[PDB]
Design a protein around this ligand. Structure first.
Ligand SMILES: N#Cc1ccc2cccc(O)c2n1
Length: 440
């Protein structure tokens, strides 16, 4: 069975292709049918709960989800006993279990929106049922743990290598003054921490391209803005080296950073350097790449081939290693955009929420889960940490204005002619000698 009429309880409408399309794997359907399958009385679907709470923000606002769960909780009696035990009792237990996984795995919804938590804390306290008391106290315990959150080394860390810049003096920090070993170490520690803070909800629905990008995807933007700045900073250090002898040493020093990146399995930092040497302003410096050592150019050629053929050699290299590693985060964004555009957000006699598209984007984020919980055994350097955290090569100009500056500056150092590149006086004063890659 005896169920209420759909005129007062929308979660009881008969199933059809007008509201739901297919433990049966749910392909899609109306948001009312998705909440019913999320908190179904016949059985429990733990896999559907994890995928829904991970991708629901692309088709349902967090305030809307809590309102639907409250609507699903308030069940009216038909025009019983078994109904209050075979329908009301199981459904309300399913909703509380959804409240558990929500506040446990995706508590950031309540941090970004304090009003969303205030509504839940009042609705949870208002439930004074008998069997629901244990689940209510369980949710309250999880909320208390998340509210209280606001340098141990197992193995001996390696010593911090220094070159020309002595510690405590952030002013003289540059690409050539710092030690290339520690540059790749601190960049790996920074890229690792930025990689671990990225939540799968920040990569669903292209939310970093929407309006509220600074709220929905705060960590994803910092990972992209670091990749963008570090790639342009490498290009800036190459194209601004007007002296030919200095420009070869700078490019060689970057390859030495690429080699340490390879040894640390920081493919993100590996392919960021590859993105710099393949840029429009750096790739045309044929005379600079020609003056390299025979071993330096071979190391770069191997790193470029990792990205060739849709990262075929890279995907084989990422599997055959062991953590700690920082995988290339750009290959994940590319497969997500190809799915967000190749699949429509809705299914169609009526418009239904295309849930299978959200699942595909969830499978891409699932591959990111396995490379996060494995810290590096490298000691952090505070002065060098803020140096790469505050890298801003564009200054006040946009990326289009800065890339045009890099291309016009590239035409100055190595002009487009068969003639030799002119010699410019070196503006630096330090030594162009590299300390090497072997830890000294
Ligand atoms: N001449 C030359 C030249 C120019 C750009 C390059 C970029 C990556 C690898 C290379 O070998 C390159 N060689």
């Amino acid at each position: 069975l005896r169920l209420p009429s759909p005129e007062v309880y929308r979660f009881v409408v008969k199933d059809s292709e007008e509201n739901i399309v297919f433990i049966p794997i749910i392909k899609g359907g109306t948001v009312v049918k998705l909440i019913e399958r999320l908190t179904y009385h016949m059985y429990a679907d733990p896999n559907f709960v994890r995928t829904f709470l991970t991708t629901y923000r692309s088709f349902c606002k967090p305030q809307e989800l809590l309102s639907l769960l409250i609507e699903r909780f308030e069940i009216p009696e038909p025009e019983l006993k078994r109904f209050r035990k075979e329908y009301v009792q199981p459904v309300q237990l399913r909703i509380l279990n959804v409240f558990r996984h929500w506040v446990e795995h995706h508590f950031y919804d309540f941090e970004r929106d304090l009003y969303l938590l205030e509504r839940l804390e009042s609705f949870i306290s208002s439930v004074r049922g008998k069997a629901m008391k244990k689940w209510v106290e369980s949710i309250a315990k999880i909320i208390r743990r998340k509210k209280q959150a606001q340098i141990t080394f197992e193995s001996p860390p390696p010593p911090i290598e220094w070159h020309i810049s002595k510690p405590g003096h952030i002013e003289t920090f540059d690409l050539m003054t710092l030690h290339p070993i520690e540059i790749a170490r601190q960049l790996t520690l920074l890229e690792s921490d930025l990689y671990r803070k990225v939540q799968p909800s920040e990569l669903v629905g292209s939310v970093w391209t929407k309006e509220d990008k600074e709220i929905n995807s705060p960590n994803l933007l910092k990972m992209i803005r670091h990749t963008t700045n570090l790639t342009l900073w490498f290009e800036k250090c190459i194209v601004e080296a007007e002296n030919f002898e200095e420009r070869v040493a700078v490019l060689s020093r970057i390859i030495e950073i690429l080699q340490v990146f390879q040894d640390l399995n920081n493919f993100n930092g590996v392919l960021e350097i590859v993105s710099a040497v393949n840029s429009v302003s750096v790739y045309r410096l044929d005379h600079t790449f020609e003056a390299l050592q025979e071993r330096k150019r071979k190391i770069l050629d191997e790193a470029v081939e990792l990205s060739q053929d849709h990262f075929k050699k890279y995907l084989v290299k990422l599997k055959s290693i062991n953590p700690p590693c920082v995988p290339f985060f750009g290959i994940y964004l590319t497969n997500i955009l190809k799915t967000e555009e190749g699949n429509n957000d809705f299914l169609t006699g009526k418009d239904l929420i295309n849930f299978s598209k959200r699942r595909k984007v969830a499978e891409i984020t699932g591959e990111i889960q396995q490379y996060q919980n494995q810290p590096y055994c490298l000691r952090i350097e505070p002065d060098m940490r803020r140096f790469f955290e505050n890298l801003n090569p564009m200054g006040s100009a946009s990326e289009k204005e800065f890339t045009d500056y890099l291309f016009n500056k590239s035409l100055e150092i190595e002009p487009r002619n068969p003639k030799q590149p002119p010699r410019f006086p070196r503006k630096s004063t330090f030594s162009l000698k590299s300390p090497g890659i072997r830890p000294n």
